[model samples]
Every structure is written in C-alpha cells, then in structure tokens.
Target: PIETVPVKLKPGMDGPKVKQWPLTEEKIKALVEICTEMEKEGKISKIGPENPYNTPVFAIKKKDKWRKLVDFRELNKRTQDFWEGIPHPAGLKKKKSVTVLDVGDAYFSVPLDEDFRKYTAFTIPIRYQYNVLPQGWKGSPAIFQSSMTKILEPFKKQNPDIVIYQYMDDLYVGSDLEIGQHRTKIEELRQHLLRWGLTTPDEPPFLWMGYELHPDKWTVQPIVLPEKDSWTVNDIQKLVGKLNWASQIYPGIKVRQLCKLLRGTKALTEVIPLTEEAELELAENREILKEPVHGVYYDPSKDLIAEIQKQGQGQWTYQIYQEPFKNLKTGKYARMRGAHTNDVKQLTEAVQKITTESIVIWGKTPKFKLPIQKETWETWWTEYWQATWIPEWEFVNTPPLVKLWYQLEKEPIVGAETFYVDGAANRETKLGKAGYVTNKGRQKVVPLTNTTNQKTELQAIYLALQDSGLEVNIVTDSQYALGIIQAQPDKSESELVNQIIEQLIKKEKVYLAWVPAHKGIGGNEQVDKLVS
Candidate 1:
C-alpha cells in the first residue's frame, strides 16, 4: 500500500503575504537551478494566477552548497496542532548489539494533497509552491511519526522479542542475537523495507549519535567544548542540555552542579561574561569527562523512578523519615512601671518597704491592715510626682510705633549714572509692579501686593538705591512716588519710609527728578512698559 498526508488549517484562517529578500546574480542562478531540479522531481511547481498565502524562500549555506527551503513561519501559526510520542536520543539503551535505520528524504516520503499546497507557496522571485510534504514545517514531525507508526505498530504487537524504537526519521532496532545474524535476519525481510520505502545504510559498528556501538560495549567519541570568548543565555542553556544528554550513558558530572550558572538566565540573547570562578568549575567538568566509560547493557526489568521538583534551590539528595509533630506552647507560660521616661521588665522580687503583707511610710496605724502610706506610697515609685503646676499669663498687646518729623528732598542728587523709574497699580485687577531702567539700557521690575501707584513707585526708587552701584541720578514721572518715602514716621507707611531712608543713607550719591508721565523719555518709557 502507498500513503500520503494533507495539511489541516485552523478554521476561518486567511494567511500570510511574506515579502521576498533581494539576491545577487550568482545567488539567483543557484536558486534557479535548485528550483528547476525540485520541479523536475515533482517537489515544487508553479502558482499561476493567484494564491491567498505566500512565504519567502531563502538559501541556507550547507557547508559547500546551498539548500533551497521555504519560509513557512506565518503559515505554521494557522495550522492545527497535533503531537504524538517520538523517541528521544537519551532513551537509547547501552545494548549488546544494534543496527540503525535512516529513511531517505524522510519528511518527503508522504506527499501533501495538491489542493492545500498553496499554503506552502513561497516567492524566490515569483510564486512557486511545494508539491510534497515540506521540511521545517511545525507539523512535519508528528505527521511523519504517526504515518510511520501505522506500519511499525503491527509488527511490534505481533513480535514480542525484538526492540523497535522510532525516533523521528531514525530507528534503533536491536537484539542479543549474533552481529552477522542480525544483518542476515534483516537482509531476509529487507525487501519489506524496500517495498515500504523504509531504507537503511549498508554499514555496521556505527556511531549511535556521538557514541560508537559494538557487540559488547558503547563508548562516547571525544567530547569537545566550543571555543569562544563569551556566551549568551541561549548558548549556555543548549550546552547544558547537551551535557545532560551525554550524562544518560556515562552519568557524567551531575547537571545540578551547574544550576548556579543556569539561575540568572532570563533574556535568551543577554550575553554573560565568563567569570574566573565559573570557568574553574567548567574546567573541572571537562577534566572529569575527558575519557568516558565503556558502559554495559541496560536491563529491561530495572525499576526506574523520576523525582521531579518545582523548586530549583532545593538539595540534590534528601533523607526522609517520619516525625510525629508535637507543637509545644512555649510562649503561653509568660506574663511594667519606670524611672525618668524609660520602662524595663522586672517582677518585684526585692520588697524594699512595701510588700503584699505590709506597707511602711510616715508612721500611721490602722485597725485591720495599714496597706496605704501617706508620705511615700511605696519605696520606689516611677518618679511620677515632681514639680507641681505651671502658671500661665492672661493676654498680650504690641507696643505702638512713635511719630517723628520728616523732610522731603528739595534738591536732586546729581553727577551720577542716570536711571528712570516707574511703578503702576492696575485700575481693576489691583495688580502692581515697580521697575527702574538705566540710561545704559539695563532695566529691572518687581511685583507688589495690596498697593497703589504711589507705594509701588516709591518701592521702585528704594529697590534701585539698594543696588548702591554708582553715584546715580533717578527720574520719575510721579511726584507722589517721591513723597511717600520722604513722608514722616508714625504715619500709615512710617515703617516702609524708615527702611527707604536707611537704604538711601548707604548709597554713594543719588538724584531724584520728577516729570509728569514723561512719554517721550526712552528709559522712562521702558520702565513703564515693564511695570504695566
């Protein structure tokens, strides 16, 4: 009988439209030759008009030549998932004798249905698709295994003595019978292998994966470490897996020994530096596994048990024993007063002058029992009683500022760096600012709270005087602004006027000139603009 399988997609699935990458002329010729060869072998063909799905095709450098392959990454996501048991390389026993079976073009053995072939359509340049089952597809392994399973399961059920383990496309079949007899027996039924298209190599004493197998023993080939400066998390994890894989035969240095290195890996691409201490441990492993042991046979009847743990920080081995729990209440047997501000723990063992039976103080007598003391209640109190009550006052009032005679400046201070000053208070918003500008084009402005133009302008002059920079001339548009600072003490703004006089006394020289909102004066105009 002949067999073939078909692709099964998830329902209501619209597929991918992957864009192709550019190729050079020489590489393009290589792709053309491979595609044409594939087409002649009925492996790939044309997609003439249209297909809903497309994947990009690319060449992988396989040492000497290129391998033509389709990129089915997006198409695989839309396909229904199917999984079945496939034997792992670790499951191979150290047996007395064995022969290997490698099926040629294993995934291609089962042809795909033509209707569903467009799902595998990829563009090297134009649209072309696979006619047979393709490699690198996610469903290839399970579909191939189950297809081969149908053929092998019948023979396994009928014959009880022989071992037939199917591991993907490879098979490991063995017996205790003679080595040449093993081949002779297979040579007789080898036509069945040919008829069913399940082929094998004409070779023996072959390497079972990395370990070579003879009649009596199975020993590993030389194990080599990768030569590199540093490794990524992905690299270290894969290397650990391979170390564990080899451990199945020799039980080499335990996997748990490297658990510390495995713990920090999160992002697979994150590069890790090789520390001197970590390299020392790895070098130790290399020393131990430099020569692997020649292992004997694995008995089918040996009891095998696996201990799986979720916690990584657990011990390698455990000692288990039954202990009857007796939760004793130690705290239930337990059960303060102070000096200054701190209290400490004690049970009054030293009864100084007071006890449960008697109390002594400034001598007193009672009929039944004198448990109360008048002068001092106990020999030691917490020093609770010291000074008596604190006295408080009734009310307070502030001393008023006294009035004094004041004088307005009759003559302007002169022969100095001249500056014009202005201050303004808003008509409606009550916003206020004071500013001064130098004839040298330097200007300054400041805001005021709860003020009038008179107060703000006075503040501007005061602020300018405090700079105390030069023997300066001052000009203002308001006479009212000048009068406020010169006004007498004990008036409404007596405190502010006093402060202004103190600042004016510290300056080298000053001049005050008045002009009524001088619109044409350049510095005066600048001050007005700044304040308003």
Candidate 2:
C-alpha cells in the first residue's frame, strides 16, 4: 500500500504553524471537486493508461540474441558540461535577420524585499515537506504561472484583436504584413512587458522575413524574369531551395524533362536521386546476352573449382548428361535427352518465363523475383515513367532549335493559385483516374481519351485554358505535352501542341510550365492526388 502526503496552505501575514493536521476525507473531496469543475469547464479531458516505450516483448522472445542496453545516466553523471536549461539568446549583435518572438507562459517570482523566514516553527523547507506552495518551494512554477497571469489580467480585460495562445511555455504571433505597423505593435507589447516587470529578450525567438541571411554569404533576392530570359533550373534553385520549391511557385514545370537540362550540372545533384546517364546510354544498344554454344565451354570461378575438387572424383558428385542434338531436316524444334532432366526442364521454363515477361536476360548471373503487381505498375507509370514516344514534328537534331523552342513557348504555370479538380468514372471497377489543372481558379479539365489517357490530358489542358479565359496561366505535370512542344516545326504532333501553346500565349495570355510529378512537393502532390 502507498502512503499519502496531504497538501497544506499557509495563511498570509500570520498563521499558526501547527494549525493544520494530516490527511482527511474533506481534503480529498475538495481535490476531486476541483478536478470535476475543471473538466466541466473543458480545461481537461481524461487521464488513462498508456503504452511504455522500449517494450521488452520482442527482446524476451530473442533472449539469446539480446544485447545490453547502454545506461546514459552514468555518462551524464561523469559529464562536467551538463546543461539543465535553455535561455534566451541575449548579448549578441543585432542584424536584419527575421526573429520570431514567442510570448510564452506567464511566470511569478517571490518578491525579493519580503521576508517570511520568521513565521512559526514551519520554515519554507518544512512547509514543502507537507507538499505545500510555500515560498521558494518546488511548486514555484505553478504559483508563478498563476500569479503572472493574474498580474497581466488587466491588460487582457478588453480581449482586443490580439490573439493569445497557450501551449506549455510556447506562444505564436502571426500576421500578414511583412513589416511597418506590425513592428510598432510588437514594440508596444514589449513595453507592456517591461511595465509588468517581465523580462523581454533583445531579439524575437522565431522570425522568418521570407529571405535568407548569412554573415559570410550573399542573400539572393527573388527577381521576376522577362518573357525572353525566363526561369531556369539555376534561377529556380537560387530562389527556392530546390526545383520542388520552384514547382510550388509555378506548377507543370516538366521536372523530368527539365531534369535533362540539369544533367551534368551540380545545381540539381541533390534533387535527383540517381545519376543514370551511363546506364541509360548503355541500354540503347539492342544486343543479346552471349551464352556458351556447341564448341564453347563454361568455367566456374577458382573458389567454385576448389569446392568441386574437395568433393573428389568418382565420389559421385551430381552430374548432368545430355543426349547429342539430333539436327534432322524435319520442321520440328530441337530435342535433348539427359539424366539432367531437371536442368533441361528449368532451361525450358526460363525461356518461357523470359518470353512471356518480354525481358531479355543479359550476360550476367541471374536473380529471380515475382513481377510487380498491377497497382504498383500503375503507380510507377504516374511516378517514374516518362513518355518516350515523340511526334516527328518536334524532332530537332540540333540543340539550337530545341533551346529556342523551349525558351519561346514553354512557360510553366505550376506555382499559381492551385485548385485540384478531379472525377471518378470507374465506380464498379475502381479503375478511377483523376485529371488535374495547374491553375485551379484559372483552368478546367476535359477528357478526350475514351481509348487512352493522353488525349484526355490534351483536351483537359485545352479546356482549362479556355475556361480560365486564356489570360490566366495553365500548368501541368505532363512531360508528354512538353516533349510534343519541344518537337520540330515539321512534326504533326509538334505543330498541334505548338499551335495550342501559341494560341494560349498569343491570344489567352496563358503561360505554361511543368512541375516534376510525385517528388514530395506540395503542388505535385496535390495534382497527383487529384489524378488518382
């Protein structure tokens, strides 16, 4: 059984040291009533059992494999530079960096001038033994918090437009204006703190002025580029932290195609997951893997040969014997005979599986796994798949033509005010597909693909531009459209997409850009969800 230590309240000015005694039902009832009142007033919800961290169930099962848990307390005891608290950053030079000032929880301290050391036999320390809020007792935080709030009560009387938030010792102040009148109001609040004898740090705790600041590095201010020298990967990377950030500024940036531009550049090294140009170029050669034929032979590595020698000859190590091939003038396929029946069966199965999967085994040791599921395949299509098919019109052999085409026509719309628009058609099949517009308030979607998803995308972009009245920009996360736009003038698909882009740019004042899809950026995620 556990013991209970009852709390006592010392009287003000003069109070009897032995006036109150120990635990009683009245005291317990009072506490319960206070808790009841708090709950009724919505101050607290409930308290219940919870799961413990670092549970031992798994460890108990694998006791033999268990390792000792390192005790950090011993290390802490040995440490000389242990810190017990966080303090305000004071005594530092001030710069134009945005500082966030958090007006935290109120605190109260015992008045230094007052002395309560001579009261009855109950000293402050002895009072605390009974779990009371005696001066300088361990309950100071609670007493101070209540006292500070009471002292500031008059200022909060009006409940002015100011917002008050309470989360432990955290408080947040938010405003729309970057500077000016807001700064003045904050200063006034600071003065109020001084009047109340509350300490205010020189710099605000948390401030973001929408710009980077560094003592040794120059800050890059955002600049609006002209239609002629439009935004590039470098420009976007400098302004935002990454291409993903820029995509937030304007959606449909064709991040994958534009990714090609970032090729061989250090600027995009962090964003792209892998460097596959070497592998990709290697894949272009359509060749078959060479295998050992009639006169040829296959040999094992030295380690395997040694392992075979260890088995000893005539010890009857498993051997495979196959009948000679009967190459007759018949129209039938070749046949093989062997005690290597399992090997022959496996080879035939491999041939069938490879042909069915439409994959060729290259000249390397093979590994096997189940093919990807249909849902996973669809996800790959939306995420990593790039439409490689290009219309002949956009085909340009030289870099100059491609550069000029992307520069003049492709202005992405990824970052405008975005609204997600989508619909579900496959109610029974759940084959539902979603289409999206880059500028939600400024665009629309129309499905032209009864047979395929591409036509639906094209019609959707056209409809979005038409609905937004052409002046509004349109962004899409589609590289397929971008590839078409990049095609040479002579190509039909290139001409068609270029005509659409031209009409939008020339007549509707609509701009276009591509956002890389499914790269963990907000815009792309929204568009992806809409499409799904």
Candidate 3:
C-alpha cells in the first residue's frame, strides 16, 4: 500500500460548508454498502465533531454502475502545493512499437495520512472520512505520481534496455526490439506492480505493433456508443479526451465537428443524438484502416498555371507574364487581372511599369538601394550571365518596413492604464456594438450602424486608443484585429490603422495583446458580456 504525504493548510483558513444532495432509496442503499465495504477494508472510518470538517458527496455513473465521489473544492483552496517530477505524456513517442497499461483503482489503493483524514470527511447517507487517498482531492495526483515513481525505480534499474514512460496510472513501454521481447519486459514490469499491491484489471494491455503501428495508414475507428438514455455529458467528455490523445499519434485524425457539437452544456440534454451521416462517416473512417491511402506532397508548378489559364479564358480573365531573364528562377509565371489575353508584350510592359520604383532593403545589417536605371540593369545582367547556374531559386515574401518612433532614452515611458476590449454582432440585423472596460472600472460602449463582428472588434481597439489620454495597454480577444495592428495593416481597416499610428506618434504607449474569450478573466469576461 502507498502512504500519502501530509498536506499543509493556510493559517487561519476555515473550510467551506457545502450541503449534501438528497439520495434515492436505491442510491442510499448503494452508498451504505460502499461505505461499509471501504470501512471493512480499512479505507474509511466514522467521523465525529472533535475533528469537524464536512464535504458533499454525489454518485457518478461508471461501467453501468453508480460510484460515490467527494467534492473537495473547498478544502483544495487551502491545500499546499506538493507537485514534483511528472513527465508530459506528449513527449512519449514510440518509433517501433508500444504497449499501454492501465492501473485499477489507482487512487484508492494509496493510504492517506491518518491525522489528515478528518479534514477529508464527507456526508453522504452518513458521515465518514477516507483513510485512503480520495478522488477529487487537489494533491492526490501529485502524491500518487511521486509514490508511483519510487515504486517503479527498482524495476527501471533492472530493465536497462526496456524504455518506460508514465503519466499517472497510464504506463507506456516503447522499444525497437521485437514484439516478443517487448511483451516479456512489460509482463515483468506488470508483475512488479502487482507485488507492490498496484493490482490492474484482467483485461490485457493495448499493443501498437507491426501493421497497427503504421502512421499514415492509421484512422479513428467508430466507437461503440452506450444506450442513448444511459449516455451522460461526462462520457462524451471522456471520449473527446481520448480522441485528443489519439490525434497526437495520427496526424489525419479529425473530430472537430463532433467536439464543437458537444461543447458547453448542450451535451447534457441528450437531444443531439449521433446523426446518420456522422455514423456513416465514422464507418468510412474505419474502412480506411483496411485499405490505406498514401499521402501526396503539394506541388505548385507550370501544370497548375496552365490549368488556371485555361479556366480563366471562359469564366475569368488573367494577365500572365514571363520574366525578362528566362534562366532566372522563381516567380517566372505571374498572374494579374486584365483583358482575357496572354500577349507577351503587354505583360512585359505591365511588369516593367511596376518595377520602375527604387527598392530599398529594410532591417538589414547593411542597407542596399537598387534604382531602376539602364546602367544598373546592364551591370546586373553582365554579372548574372557570367555566374554559374544554381538549381535553386530565391523566393521570399516582401518584408514589412520598420520605423523608429521615439529616440533612445535612459528612462522609458510606461502605460498607466489597461483595458479589455471586445465586440459582438447579429448577422440578421447587420448591427453590432464595441465596448471596453478599464482596469479602474471605467467602461464605454458604441453602437455600429453597419458592421461585422470582425469590424466591430477592430473598431473597439481604435475607439479605446482615441479616447485614452494616458499611456494604455489594450487587451482584446480578436486575433484578426491583433494581427492587423501588429503586422500587415489590412486595406479595409487602413483608416483605423492610420488613426492608431497617430496615437502612437503622440507617445501614447499603446499596446495590443490577445486573450481567449469566456475564460472567466475579470476584465475580458466583463467586456464580452457588455458587447453581447
């Protein structure tokens, strides 16, 4: 059995008193039986007022049966941190083969410190305290991970070649050796865990070996659903959690649609059953496993250009141009909007008209300016023609121009105010609102006559910067707005971008940062509610 580490509570902290839920006749009997079993096994004991602390209890469905669980949220607030070394599961990758093991009743098997058990008391059908580590306790995972690591240290030393990765109760073994050798090592490890009283279920561990280990060939098989009435929101949550893990190994896996539908409390209603189309898609996904399709690389070449030109003649119009130097690599074929023709002379003139401006390299160690003059062109051509041919071409996007606003100084100006801004819109009404809340509790909202959520979101930041006299930090939930402000300014919002730049020129110290929406941040949630 495992021993629990003592947890320290904050000085002068008092635990919250939560009311217990009413249990049905059947549920009451089940709770009594469960408590009795635990008491007989020395995992729990009766509690009294001498060590007064009480928590609520509820039943959760697991494997078609009810399991009682405690709510330790109040106590958790006062619990001290005990987290130590815990490896991330994503870093565990198996190049050849892998085996996964699951531990049964992982938390309950660990013993709790006798002195601290009173603080874990709960009122179900009757008042009792856990003598073993309980689920929903804040420090349980950290304590279990630390204990399990110590338990596995000896086994790890014995098996030098066999690699083991663990996250809580889930154990993974990865090796380049044959399946036989892998199974042997896993069996040895399994017996060691059993000897330490960490008994696992009778079901065999999952094996990802041979053909099952193919990367591109893998697909998510359809899951067997429980009866519609029996299904709960927790079940779907667990399934989504598993799919998230499966996505790490299988790149082609997609369950976003299913996940979106299941988001929020809608899954609790059971009104959204698995659709026929979804079932068919799930079935088709499983079929891909038997007959795997190879993935192809994306290529944009002359063939793509020819197809675009052919389609453009009837439905659209395009201007195609060939570079002045045939041997020069990359961007040889350029497309522009014009009359439906591929005349070489017209294309050449169009390209030349645009290239007349002088180009200067920005943000380089040594800046170079290339003027569009006959002498420069002739000199470049003479050297280019004499140089050896390279198989590669230099293809790069135009870099943004940088400008210095303020001169370097010993003491820098800092923002005195921070605001969270957000916007919302109703498509049917074509109306929206933009709003922002300052850290000092000041707020303002503006109505839009004609706009989208994206436009309103951008306008919100613009309004905040225009109104604020002091240096300010503008926090927003719109990435689209953040990108335009930080990098390339969009043409549609160029007017607003200019206004924002004017604010910066005044040394407003305006900064934009993106935060996720509806995550319970005081400022962000306030703005979100205001806009909505």
Residue 180 miss distance in model 1 (angstroms) = 3.6
Please report, in order, the local distance difference test score of every candidate based on alpha carbons: 0.54, 0.33, 0.55
lDDT of 3 at 68: 81
Off by over 4 Å in 2: 1-434, 438-449, 470-472, 488-502, 508-510, 524-527, 530-532
Better of 1 and 2 by lDDT: 1
Choose 1 or 3, whichever is better by lDDT: 3
**Per-model TM against the reference:** 0.45, 0.19, 0.46
RMSD of each: 29.7, 32.6, 19.6
Which lDDT tens digits does candidate 2 get at residues 1-532? 1112222334232332232223345444443454455346433333222211111010111221321111121112222221111111110122332334544323322231112212212211012111112322333344454544665566555436444332234433333434575577567666775676555666332322212223312122342322212343434333233434433222222345335544445432255443455324322311211111111111222111100001111111111111122110001112233211222222233333333222221122222221223343243334433332111111213221111121223343444443333333333444444455453333333333342345444544555544454244545656765455433222233333545555554443345566665565555354455534
For candidate 1, what's the RMSD?
A: 29.7
- How badly does each model clash, as a count of residue pairs? 1, 34, 0
Over all chains combined, what TM-score does candidate 2 have? 0.19
Ranking by lDDT: 3, 1, 2
Full candidate order by TM-score, most accurate first: 3, 1, 2
Predicted candidate 1 versus true structure: per-residue lDDT over 13-66, tens digit per residue:
777666665556777787888888778876789788568666766665653166
